[PDB]
Design a protein around this ligand. Structure first.
Ligand SMILES: [Mg+2]
Ligand SMILES: [Mg+2]
Ligand SMILES: [Mg+2]
Ligand SMILES: [Mg+2]
Ligand SMILES: [Mg+2]
Ligand SMILES: [Mg+2]
Ligand SMILES: [Mg+2]
Ligand SMILES: [Mg+2]
Ligand SMILES: [Mg+2]
Ligand SMILES: [Mg+2]
Ligand SMILES: [Mg+2]
Ligand SMILES: [Mg+2]
Ligand SMILES: [Mg+2]
Ligand SMILES: [Mg+2]
Ligand SMILES: [Mg+2]
Ligand SMILES: [Mg+2]
Ligand SMILES: [Mg+2]
Ligand SMILES: [Mg+2]
Ligand SMILES: [Mg+2]
Ligand SMILES: [Mg+2]
Ligand SMILES: [Mg+2]
Ligand SMILES: [Mg+2]
Ligand SMILES: [Mg+2]
Ligand SMILES: [Mg+2]
Ligand SMILES: [Mg+2]
Ligand SMILES: [Mg+2]
Ligand SMILES: [Mg+2]
Ligand SMILES: [Mg+2]
Ligand SMILES: [Mg+2]
Ligand SMILES: [Mg+2]
Ligand SMILES: [Mg+2]
Ligand SMILES: [Mg+2]
Ligand SMILES: [Mg+2]
Ligand SMILES: [Mg+2]
Ligand SMILES: [Mg+2]
Ligand SMILES: [Mg+2]
Ligand SMILES: [Mg+2]
Ligand SMILES: [Mg+2]
Ligand SMILES: [Mg+2]
Ligand SMILES: [Mg+2]
Ligand SMILES: [Mg+2]
Ligand SMILES: [Mg+2]
Ligand SMILES: [Mg+2]
Ligand SMILES: [Mg+2]
Ligand SMILES: [Mg+2]
Ligand SMILES: [Mg+2]
Ligand SMILES: [Mg+2]
Ligand SMILES: [Mg+2]
Ligand SMILES: [Mg+2]
Ligand SMILES: [Mg+2]
Ligand SMILES: [Mg+2]
Ligand SMILES: [Mg+2]
Ligand SMILES: [Mg+2]
Ligand SMILES: [Mg+2]
Ligand SMILES: [Mg+2]
Ligand SMILES: [Mg+2]
Ligand SMILES: [Mg+2]
Ligand SMILES: [Mg+2]
Ligand SMILES: [Mg+2]
Ligand SMILES: [Mg+2]
Ligand SMILES: [Mg+2]
Ligand SMILES: [Mg+2]
Ligand SMILES: [Mg+2]
Ligand SMILES: [Mg+2]
Ligand SMILES: [Mg+2]
Ligand SMILES: [Mg+2]
Ligand SMILES: [Mg+2]
Ligand SMILES: [Mg+2]
Ligand SMILES: [Mg+2]
Ligand SMILES: [Mg+2]
Ligand SMILES: [Mg+2]
Ligand SMILES: [Mg+2]
Ligand SMILES: [Mg+2]
Ligand SMILES: [Mg+2]
Ligand SMILES: [Mg+2]
Ligand SMILES: [Mg+2]
Ligand SMILES: [Mg+2]
Ligand SMILES: [Mg+2]
Ligand SMILES: [Mg+2]
Ligand SMILES: [Mg+2]
Ligand SMILES: [Mg+2]
Ligand SMILES: [Mg+2]
Ligand SMILES: [Mg+2]
Ligand SMILES: [Mg+2]
Ligand SMILES: [Mg+2]
Ligand SMILES: [Mg+2]
Ligand SMILES: [Mg+2]
Ligand SMILES: [Mg+2]
Ligand SMILES: [Mg+2]
Ligand SMILES: [Mg+2]
Ligand SMILES: [Mg+2]
Ligand SMILES: [Mg+2]
Ligand SMILES: [Mg+2]
Ligand SMILES: [Zn+2]
Lengths: 204, 140, 174, 37, 7
RNA sequence: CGCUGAAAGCAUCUAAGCGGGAAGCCCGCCCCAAGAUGAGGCCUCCCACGGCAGCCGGUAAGGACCCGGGAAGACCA
RNA sequence: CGAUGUCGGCUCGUCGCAUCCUGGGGCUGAAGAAGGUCCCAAGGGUUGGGCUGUUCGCCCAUUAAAGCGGCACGCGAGCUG
C-alpha cells in the first residue's frame, strides 16, 4: 500500500499500439517523509508526506519546529498515506510502474449552489403543455399527513462539488522520473493545479 | 421539623467484577449504587451516589438463547436505517456496551440520570485505569 | 434395550483416562479426546470402561447412551481405526492420488483435488475405489461425505460417487 | 418438500421427527418429505 | 376564481 | 443438505457436539464524521508578566481586521 | 360542512412481500434442454410505443423481467386540468 502527493497538470492523449489513449498528467514527486505514525506512538501505520517547497520566511514557528525534527525544508502541504512505510526518506514517482492500477483522490470542481437537475439528474418539469414556473423544479418532496415529514438524505438543491472524490483503478500509462511525471489513463477529479493523491489500487 | 438534607457528600468509588454474573441482575444493583439509594441520606435531586468501576464486563452471563435472540437496535433517522445487532455480535465487537445499555435503561431519564450514567466506568478484561481513586471492591 | 449400560471392552493395551468433562483415549494408532457431560460418570474397570447416569430424567438417559458410544467409538478408533470406501461409477470417471491429495476426474471441465485433513489418509487401490482412513470416526464420515458430494449418485444412471454398499436405485427415462 | 399445516404419515415407511422446533416427516419416498409450516 | 368545487 | 449420535439395542441433521449452504446479513469499497459534551490521539510552538478556578492592563506563540485575487463562493465560509 | 380540494397524469421518492426477474433450495408424471409446484430471499432491477381523460385493459416491438399492493385511491401552499 503505497501513495504519493501530486498535482494535476492537464489532459492529453498519447498513442499506444495504434490506439489513442486519453491521459491525465500528474506531477507527483518528490515527497519527503516528514513524520512516521507508528502503532507504538499513534496507534496506526502511515507516513506523513510533504509536497512543494514553501518560502521559509512564510512558515510559522509551530510548523518550523515540526519540519526541524525531520530535517526537511518547509513544504507547502502535508498529507498522510495510511498503511505505508517506505524504506527511504523521499517518495518519488518510481514507486509506480507502467501497467499498475492506481486510485486517485482530488477535490471535484465546485458547482456552487446547484439545482436539483444539475446536482441529482432530476427530470424537472415540462417546458410547455401548461407547465407553470416549475420547469426545473423537483416536484413532490413527500407524502401527506403520514409521515407528515421529509426523509433525511432527501435529494434537494444545495452546494455540489468541491468535495473529496476518489476515482479508482486507473491504469498507469507512463512514468517519467526525470520530470516527476505520472501519466494515468482517463479522468481525475478537480482542476488543473489541484492537489491529488495517487495510491495503489484496492480493486483486485 | 424539616427533613435532613446533606451537604455535598464525598463520593465513594467501588469496584465490581462482572465475571459470571447475570446481565440484568447485576445492572439492577449498579443502578441502585449510582442512584445512591443504599445511603441513609439519599436525596432524589443530587448526584450523591457512588462511582462504580466494573471489570470483566465481557464475561457477563445471560440465560436462555439471548446470545442469538437478544437484538439491540439503533435507528439513524434515514429511510431504512433501523440496524439490528444481536447480543453475540455486540459482545464480539463492543462488549462493554452490553452492561452499559442495561444499566442505562434502569437509570432515571433526564439531566440527573444522564450524569449518574457518567459515574459508571465499564471495562472489558480484568484491568481498569482508576487506580488513582483506590476503589473499594464490592461483592455483589 | 440400553446402549449406555453396556460396558465398553478395552483392548490391551489401550489406555482410558478420566478427567472433568473429558476422557482421554490413547491407543496404538493415536489418541482422541471425548468431551463428556459432567452429569455422567465414567468409571474405569479391568479392561472395561463403564458409564453411569445420575437419574432417569430424559436428559440423563439421552446423554447416557450418547456418552457410552462416544467412548466406545474412540476406543475402537485408537486400536482398529475407522475407514470408509467409496466407489466411482460411470464411463469416464476415475481417481488417483497426487501426493497425499485426492484427485477426482468425474465429468467436469476440470479435475477436483481433495486435500486430506489432519488425521485422514487417502488411498486409491483401483482407479474406481477410494478409501478414507483415520482414527476419528466422525471425521472419517465427514471427509467421505465431502468427497461423495463432488459428484453424487445420479438418479437415472449408475454414475457418480457411491458409498461402498450403497444401493443403486434408479428411475426410468422415457 | 411438501410444506403444510397438516403433516401426516403417508405410508408405513414414513417417520415423523422433530428437529429445531419444527415437525418433519422423513421417508424413503422423496414425495413424502414434509415440513410443517 | 372561487371555491374548490367539491361536488 | 449433511457427519457423528442417544432418548427408543434399530432409526433419526439434534436432544451433547461438528460440517455445508443465498443477488440477502456483518465486515470489506467510496463519502461524511470527536457538538462521539463519551467533546479522543500524535507532532510542533508560546509560557511561569505586571496590580485589590477570580481580576484588569501590556505581551507571547499565534489569530483577526484591511487589501490583491481564486475552476472557492448567494452573503458567510 | 366559521372547507380535511375531489379522478387521472407528470415529478419525487419510500415501504410491505402474498416474489415478476436476478441468487439459494426441495419435490416432479425431473433423460438433457426447457418447464411445473412449493420453500428461502425485498439487495438491485422491473423497457419504448398504438388506443382511451382514463385507473384498468387490449394491441405492437422488445425483455432477465416487463410483479402486486401501502404511504389521505402517497404527492394540486410541487405542476397539469
Ligand atoms: Mg485546457
Ligand atoms: Mg507506452
Ligand atoms: Mg493549510
Ligand atoms: Mg486534497
Ligand atoms: Mg475545487
Ligand atoms: Mg466537471
Ligand atoms: Mg462555482
Ligand atoms: Mg433544477
Ligand atoms: Mg449532473
Ligand atoms: Mg443534467
Ligand atoms: Mg450530478
Ligand atoms: Mg423529463
Ligand atoms: Mg419526464
Ligand atoms: Mg426537460
Ligand atoms: Mg419554458
Ligand atoms: Mg394555468
Ligand atoms: Mg397559471
Ligand atoms: Mg408555480
Ligand atoms: Mg413557463
Ligand atoms: Mg416542486
Ligand atoms: Mg395536507
Ligand atoms: Mg393531497
Ligand atoms: Mg409523523
Ligand atoms: Mg463547498
Ligand atoms: Mg477493467
Ligand atoms: Mg517537472
Ligand atoms: Mg483536485
Ligand atoms: Mg492549494
Ligand atoms: Mg431534621
Ligand atoms: Mg449480580
Ligand atoms: Mg445519585
Ligand atoms: Mg440522587
Ligand atoms: Mg444464550
Ligand atoms: Mg418517570
Ligand atoms: Mg457436505
Ligand atoms: Mg392432506
Ligand atoms: Mg429414512
Ligand atoms: Mg448416522
Ligand atoms: Mg444409534
Ligand atoms: Mg445442538
Ligand atoms: Mg453450520
Ligand atoms: Mg459458511
Ligand atoms: Mg454481484
Ligand atoms: Mg475526512
Ligand atoms: Mg475535539
Ligand atoms: Mg477529525
Ligand atoms: Mg462533559
Ligand atoms: Mg456534559
Ligand atoms: Mg450517546
Ligand atoms: Mg471530559
Ligand atoms: Mg482535541
Ligand atoms: Mg487513538
Ligand atoms: Mg466569500
Ligand atoms: Mg469575492
Ligand atoms: Mg463575496
Ligand atoms: Mg467582512
Ligand atoms: Mg365538510
Ligand atoms: Mg376559520
Ligand atoms: Mg378552522
Ligand atoms: Mg377555510
Ligand atoms: Mg384550511
Ligand atoms: Mg411527461
Ligand atoms: Mg410505490
Ligand atoms: Mg416468502
Ligand atoms: Mg429465482
Ligand atoms: Mg432459481
Ligand atoms: Mg424448482
Ligand atoms: Mg424430457
Ligand atoms: Mg433440467
Ligand atoms: Mg417446499
Ligand atoms: Mg428485492
Ligand atoms: Mg421491488
Ligand atoms: Mg399517431
Ligand atoms: Mg398514450
Ligand atoms: Mg391507458
Ligand atoms: Mg377500460
Ligand atoms: Mg417472457
Ligand atoms: Mg427467461
Ligand atoms: Mg408498457
Ligand atoms: Mg400501488
Ligand atoms: Mg407498485
Ligand atoms: Mg390506509
Ligand atoms: Mg380506496
Ligand atoms: Mg383509482
Ligand atoms: Mg374511491
Ligand atoms: Mg391521489
Ligand atoms: Mg393528489
Ligand atoms: Mg392547483
Ligand atoms: Mg390532482
Ligand atoms: Mg398538498
Ligand atoms: Mg395546500
Ligand atoms: Mg397543505
Ligand atoms: Mg375541463
Ligand atoms: Zn412414506
Amino acid at each position: 500500500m503505497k501513495g504519493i502527493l501530486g498535482v494535476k497538470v492537464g489532459m492529453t492523449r498519447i498513442f499506444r499500439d495504434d490506439r489513442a489513449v486519453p491521459v491525465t498528467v500528474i506531477l507527483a514527486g518528490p515527497c519527503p517523509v516528514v513524520q512516521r505514525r507508528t502503532p507504538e506512538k499513534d496507534g496506526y501505520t502511515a507516513v506523513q508526506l510533504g509536497f512543494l517547497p514553501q518560502n521559509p520566511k512564510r512558515v510559522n514557528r509551530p510548523l518550523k519546529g515540526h519540519f526541524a525534527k525531520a530535517g526537511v525544508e518547509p513544504v507547502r502541504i502535508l498529507r498522510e498515506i495510511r498503511d505505508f512505510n517506505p524504506e527511504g526518506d523521499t517518495v518519488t514517482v518510481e514507486i509506480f510502474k507502467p501497467g499498475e492500477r492506481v486510485d486517485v483522490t482530488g477535490t471535484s470542481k465546485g458547482r456552487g449552489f446547484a439545482g436539483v437537475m444539475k446536482r441529482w439528474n432530476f427530470a424537472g418539469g415540462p417546458d410547455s403543455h401548461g407547465a407553470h414556473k416549475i420547469h426545473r423544479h423537483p416536484g413532490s418532496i413527500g407524502n401527506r399527513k403520514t409521515p407528515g415529514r421529509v426523509y433525511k438524505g432527501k435529494k434537494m438543491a444545495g452546494h455540489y462539488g468541491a468535495e473529496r472524490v476518489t476515482v479508482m483503478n486507473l491504469e498507469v500509462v507512463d512514468v517519467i522520473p526525470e520530470e516527476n511525471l505520472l501519466l494515468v489513463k482517463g479522468a481525475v477529479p478537480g482542476p488543473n493545479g489541484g492537489l491529488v493523491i495517487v495510491r495503489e489500487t484496492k480493486k483486485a | 421539623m424539616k427533613t435532613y438534607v446533606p451537604k455535598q457528600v464525598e463520593p465513594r468509588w467501588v469496584l465490581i467484577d462482572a465475571e459470571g454474573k447475570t446481565l440484568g441482575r447485576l445492572a439492577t444493583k449498579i443502578a441502585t449504587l449510582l442512584r445512591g439509594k443504599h445511603r441513609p441520606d439519599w436525596t432524589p435531586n443530587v448526584a450523591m451516589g457512588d462511582f462504580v468501576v466494573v471489570v470483566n464486563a465481557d464475561k457477563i452471563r445471560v440465560t436462555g438463547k439471548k446470545l442469538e435472540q437478544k437484538i439491540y437496535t439503533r435507528y439513524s433517522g434515514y429511510p431504512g436505517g433501523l440496524k439490528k445487532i444481536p447480543l453475540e455480535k455486540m459482545l464480539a465487537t463492543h462488549p462493554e456496551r452490553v452492561l452499559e445499555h442495561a444499566v442505562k435503561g434502569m437509570l432515571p431519564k433526564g439531566p440527573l440520570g444522564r450524569r449518574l450514567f457518567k459515574r459508571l466506568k465499564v471495562y472489558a478484561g480484568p484491568d481498569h485505569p482508576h487506580q488513582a481513586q483506590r476503589p473499594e471492591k464490592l461483592e455483589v | 434395550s440400553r446402549i449406555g449400560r453396556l460396558p465398553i471392552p478395552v483392548p490391551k493395551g489401550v489406555s482410558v483416562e478420566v478427567a472433568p468433562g473429558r476422557v482421554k483415549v490413547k491407543g496404538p494408532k493415536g489418541e482422541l479426546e471425548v468431551p463428556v457431560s459432567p452429569e455422567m460418570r465414567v468409571v474405569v474397570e479391568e479392561g472395561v470402561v463403564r458409564v453411569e447416569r445420575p437419574s432417569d430424567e430424559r436428559r440423563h438417559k439421552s446423554l447416557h447412551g450418547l456418552t457410552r458410544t462416544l467412548i466406545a467409538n474412540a476406543v475402537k478408533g485408537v486400536s482398529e481405526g475407522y475407514s470408509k470406501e467409496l466407489l466411482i461409477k460411470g464411463i469416464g470417471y476415475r481417481a488417483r492420488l497426487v501426493g497425499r491429495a485426492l484427485e477426482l476426474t468425474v465429468g467436469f471441465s476440470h479435475p477436483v483435488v481433495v486435500e486430506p485433513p489432519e488425521g485422514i489418509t487417502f488411498e486409491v487401490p483401483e482407479p474406481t475405489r477410494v478409501r478414507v482412513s483415520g482414527i476419528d470416526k466422525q471425521k472419517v464420515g465427514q471427509v467421505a461425505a465431502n468427497i461423495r458430494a463432488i459428484r453424487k449418485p445420479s438418479a437415472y444412471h449408475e454414475k457418480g460417487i457411491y458409498y461402498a454398499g450403497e444401493p443403486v436405485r434408479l428411475k426410468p427415462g422415457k | 418438500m411438501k410444506v403444510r399445516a397438516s403433516v401426516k404419515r403417508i405410508c408405513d415407511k414414513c417417520k415423523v421427527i422433530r428437529r429445531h422446533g419444527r415437525v418433519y416427516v422423513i421417508c424413503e419416498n422423496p414425495k413424502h418429505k414434509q415440513r410443517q409450516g | 376564481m372561487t371555491h374548490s368545487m367539491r361536488c
